[PDB]
Design a protein around this ligand. Sequence first.
Ligand SMILES: Nc1ncnc2c1ncn2[C@@H]1O[C@H](COP(=O)(O)OP(=O)(O)OP(=O)(O)O)[C@@H](O)[C@H]1O
Ligand SMILES: Nc1ncnc2c1ncn2[C@@H]1O[C@H](COP(=O)(O)OP(=O)(O)O)[C@@H](O)[C@H]1O
Ligand SMILES: Nc1ncnc2c1ncn2[C@@H]1O[C@H](COP(=O)(O)OP(=O)(O)O)[C@@H](O)[C@H]1O
Ligand SMILES: [Mg+2]
Ligand SMILES: [Mg+2]
Lengths: 468, 468, 464, 48
Amino acid sequence: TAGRVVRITGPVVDVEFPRGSVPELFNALHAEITFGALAKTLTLEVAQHLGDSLVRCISMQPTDGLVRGVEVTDTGASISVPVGDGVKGHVFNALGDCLDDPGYGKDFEHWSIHRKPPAFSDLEPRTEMLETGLKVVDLLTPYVRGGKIALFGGAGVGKTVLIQEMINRIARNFGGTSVFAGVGERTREGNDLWVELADANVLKDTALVFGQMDEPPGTRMRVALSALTMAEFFRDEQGQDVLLFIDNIFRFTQAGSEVSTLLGRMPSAVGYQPTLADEMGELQERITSTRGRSITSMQAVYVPADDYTDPAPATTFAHLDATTELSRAVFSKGIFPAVDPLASSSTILDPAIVGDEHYRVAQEVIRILQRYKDLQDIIAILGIDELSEEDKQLVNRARRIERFLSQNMMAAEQFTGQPGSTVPLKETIEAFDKLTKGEFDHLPEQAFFLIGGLDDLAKKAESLGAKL
Amino acid sequence: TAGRVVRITGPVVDVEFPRGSVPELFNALHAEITFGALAKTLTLEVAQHLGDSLVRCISMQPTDGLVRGVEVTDTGASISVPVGDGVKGHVFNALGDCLDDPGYGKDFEHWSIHRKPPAFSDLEPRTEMLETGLKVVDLLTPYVRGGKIALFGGAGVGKTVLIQEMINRIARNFGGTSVFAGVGERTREGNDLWVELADANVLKDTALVFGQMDEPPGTRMRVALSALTMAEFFRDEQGQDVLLFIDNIFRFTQAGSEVSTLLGRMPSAVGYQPTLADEMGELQERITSTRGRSITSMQAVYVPADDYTDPAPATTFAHLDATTELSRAVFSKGIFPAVDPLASSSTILDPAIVGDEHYRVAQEVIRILQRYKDLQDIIAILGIDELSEEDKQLVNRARRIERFLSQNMMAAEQFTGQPGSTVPLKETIEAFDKLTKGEFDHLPEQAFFLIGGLDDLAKKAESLGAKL
Amino acid sequence: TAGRVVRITGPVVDVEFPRGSVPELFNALHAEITFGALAKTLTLEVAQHLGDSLVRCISMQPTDGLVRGVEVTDTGASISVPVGDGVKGHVFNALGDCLDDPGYGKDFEHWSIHRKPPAFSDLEPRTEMLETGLKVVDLLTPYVRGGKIALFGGAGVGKTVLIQEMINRIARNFGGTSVFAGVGERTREGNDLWVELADANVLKDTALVFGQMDEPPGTRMRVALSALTMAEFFRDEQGQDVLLFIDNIFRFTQAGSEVSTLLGRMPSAVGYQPTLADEMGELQERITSTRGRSITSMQAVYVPADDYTDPAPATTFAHLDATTELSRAVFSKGIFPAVDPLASSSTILDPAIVGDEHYRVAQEVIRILQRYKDLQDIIAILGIDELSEEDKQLVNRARRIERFLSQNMMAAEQFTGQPGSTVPLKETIEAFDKLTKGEFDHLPEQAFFLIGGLDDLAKKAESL
Amino acid sequence: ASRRRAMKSATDNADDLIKALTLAANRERQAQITQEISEIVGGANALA
Ligand SMILES: Nc1ncnc2c1ncn2[C@@H]1O[C@H](COP(=O)(O)OP(=O)(O)OP(=O)(O)O)[C@@H](O)[C@H]1O
Ligand SMILES: Nc1ncnc2c1ncn2[C@@H]1O[C@H](COP(=O)(O)OP(=O)(O)O)[C@@H](O)[C@H]1O
Ligand SMILES: Nc1ncnc2c1ncn2[C@@H]1O[C@H](COP(=O)(O)OP(=O)(O)O)[C@@H](O)[C@H]1O
Ligand SMILES: [Mg+2]
Ligand SMILES: [Mg+2]
């Protein structure tokens, strides 16, 4: 009842089985590579039924050294990962193998990494602010507790530093458990996160799953499912509040695109897989809070070539309750976090949820920034000296506002040696209310740059010779 | 001798016939859908001979419910439509069936919808103005009686309103026959036009052939040919002047491109079929006047995505005598009809035909508008004060001219709630000669918005506090 | 052992051979078109082995009139061009056939046009300057011996006269020879060039290889390699220094793209052939200095849409060592050669290569000319009166410098009877150092037109 | 004097803007050619 490899095309393997023993879709098959340096056991995942008892499978490990005709065995079940309280404090790969302690977790209960999302009748919308202490996030894009937050950004604009910032701000003072999913990112970043969580004592509450850049596309597109399976066990089987950090989900999409190319599928727009929205939706709909069971998920989303129109982030947008878009233009200004206040959004930034004062201040800030953006065209050529008096006043106010939205982050100290700051939501609302009213028009712009609340503004303005 | 369906893929059906019974290209074949809910008779037009006695056909009706292997009958001829005076006052579809009176015209003479265009020796250039009463059209895009007129523009710029306006202005008093071909347009618009013609008492003299945008691609391909066949009969047999209104001719090309890849043809640039120019050329060259036999045709041409460089409108341009090009930019200014005076053209706008004064005034208007277009960016950035005195005067004149080219049309009363107006050509020439000389520079530009002649201008200036 | 045509689709021809007789890739095959009106011998170049004993080939001539099943003869080698001193003074096509004298050179030694670049060891680690003798070129945009020079310039800018000048200087100063490669050559312009070189009496020092506009893409792709093969023979076997002219290199790239499309390969970015860099590198790496002898190349480059980031110019400039722009403005002034000293540049104008004195003098000249160019608009609009006194002094000095960059060229003798000059590099450096310092501003401007070194300057000043 | 300085600055700003816009336009032109070829060859391969 064993199969045999008939075709090998990179990470994709075609296996012929005896009639009547064709494995089911997503079944995990096993093959052997015997060549010395590359000797290993390949785990393949049945992806297609090609007909004539052939199945096309995706290899989780590289296929180098695989020979046609070697026998392929069927496990009878899909890939499964260990679940339970024992996965906390340990590092796993996409297949559930423990890296910090090989052999650990083999005795745990094992859950298939493929399952349907929660039934529609179990879904209840989440509208509850999750305060972070970041002025821009709390004011303009409030995060939802038990909801879905995404961090969109191009290369090097600060997605990972902001993920570390949110781990610091949210995960440390967190009652429940955390799951981190390194999806196709730097391995040394995973090592740094592991060490930092160990130092901060958060590791004992966290399960880390890593399929990083130096992996075949199958692993890079299944590691997210493995981490989500652990998070789902924590949500469903223990009623724990779960923190889910994914970095980076675009890597899951990109791995899917590579696999689709290897599977002989017809390319879609921009060369992406035809089932881009389908795969993205399956994965994302599994990531959710159900009635009485909370998953606060935060995902970094890489944006190729800084093109926010790319199909991958464009499809990702729909699955989110809060979206923090990081801009190259803001980053170039030295503003951290490099949040684009106009492009970013939150589903709970409405008067009914955050209150009339918070909403009013946020809307006024957005209006001022939008007017500044509109004036950019004139300003680029002629400076601010050709604008009306109202426009000059508004532009100075907008510059101060956009500098004040920046902040000295907790996770930025390693870069600057400057300890981070946390601003209460009420202080943030009051400060931006005053700033929109023009009460700080006399202070120099730099006084607003990379500081905390109003007290820090006063101290910095004093240091610069200005008086508040 | 009958064929049978072999392959069904959307609107394209492969049919296998016995050797020696293969139907000729463009023959009409009949197949039966017997499923009760969708029971009907499919008409298939033979598009290709595939060899081995298979023909590829385009269905005229949706193929849902069709079954492989069902008998296919060959009519031995192309699609044919009724012709004669009887078709006047009635509504047909691409297949010749009467919609208002089903079964009507079955006993009329029938003409094949596929026809060669007139011989080159029978073609005589037409140079005779067709006065409409629209200031902009009569001044800058004079229409040719017996010539080919097109209304270009993107979606929702006023192509159909202008077609209805031209129906009102031209067909209302036409001494000949009118044929209206609704090619792949909204059914609501078709019903509105039917009711409007019945109310205006113009229906008695008009034959309507409708193939809507909900029809399959084959119907949208062939409806224009059907209406054109009726028009050709009226031109060549009845020997009377004919008005041919087509809306929208681009739908013919679009429907052709919808089936191009299903017919096996490699796509051309911008996704169009390789045969775009040839099919368009055949169809358009049938739409002509011959020596002593007049067809004044007026076509609405949709410009995809406002891109006038798109291959469809670009290929269409060569087939026209006069082209009124509607602009989204003019539309968004509230100027109606949204004609781009700098981009429209007429073959008879030269001193020899329209006369020295008309040509002079038109050229002066175009020059002023071109200079204003050049100065727009400077006015937007550096302001109008930095222009030279003559440039400021020209800008005022050009703004008044662009407003005055606007007009309240009868067909637009449903939108503006304002009755339409008709301006004689001589009055238009005199008014624009006065404008280009600055004789109305003292009137507010708002006085020139959506009015008729100089009497309406004086009235509106009085209403605004001015006086000429 | 002869093949037969099986498929014909424009210039692409499929040929079937017996089992043991499949030609190697790039071999030249000969078929026959016997139809009287279009009769000819058809040259095919093996492009792919399709398997089943079928080869796909590119026809070097139009296939119009070709029949399926006609015999195809394998020549056993790729396209081979005649070499030797005998190719000088004659016009050849990309296949080696002599055009000005059909059958000429058929007995010469023949070299395959597909050759590797010099081995890694054989290359010279040190970049060397090619002292042409022209003041502007030597000072501001020195040429690299064995390197590549891009040439930019419209019509009526002395481009042809500059090419003749370089032919003269390579023939006389270095005792070398020239090969002109007309890639995508206009037939009218090719005839013009042939006649002009004959009239200038420099055709004897030049070998012309034309792949014309109205030939299938294969010949336009291979003409550059043919001319390069002639130059390589002159360098390696005759031990000469060669000057290879390519006009236009972009047309070599475009013919490569056309051939790639004809063979069914998927286009790469912006529609160029997937191996654009590989083809350009294979061509350009053969132009170099090896074993004390060099091929220097001056290449006309077309920039699509003026976009220097376009893949074609982007790949070509990866190999270009210097740039020379010919300006309508300079030419209208009567300054010959009409080089644009500001737009033109050289990669070896660095102190580490040409020394500190040369670098300093060239930089000072560039600074003065740039400042004068800045003041040009003021001078044109408000006149020279509005200029400051220091501005007027700089304007006079810059006018004299820009006019001393002109030179009486060897190829200009046939127009202005005066013979040309060859200014030594050190003489030019010192002369322009003095000019920049302000040691000739008293002399009249006219004295700086079309002269050599300082001796000629003194004589022309005395004559005024 | 300040008007001369400001107009010099504005002219330089317009130079930089034109350069950046031309680079963006050339990038868009190349991308359009690449995407058109992608669609054409995708259709051709699908037909094959
Ligand atoms: N808050 C901050 N303060 C100071 N510097 C910062 C801050 N955030 C990011 N940086 C700088 O930006 C660099 C890139 O940040 P980060 O790695 O978080 O970006 P990213 O979007 O995840 O990048 P990539 O696409 O490479 O994964 C950091 O290494 C640091 O140099
Ligand atoms: N002359 C006009 N005056 C006022 N509104 C107009 C006029 N012409 C068009 N419009 C508005 O623009 C819309 C688009 O017109 P229509 O011709 O139906 O679309 P299209 O140009 O796509 O055929 C109309 O429904 C109407 O609301
Ligand atoms: N040094 C010079 N002396 C006299 N005339 C020259 C000189 N250089 C160029 N010219 C003139 O300029 C023209 C340039 O044309 P040509 O030599 O074809 O170059 P291009 O191809 O740039 O036009 C020639 O007709 C020639 O008469
Ligand atoms: Mg990162
Ligand atoms: Mg319409």
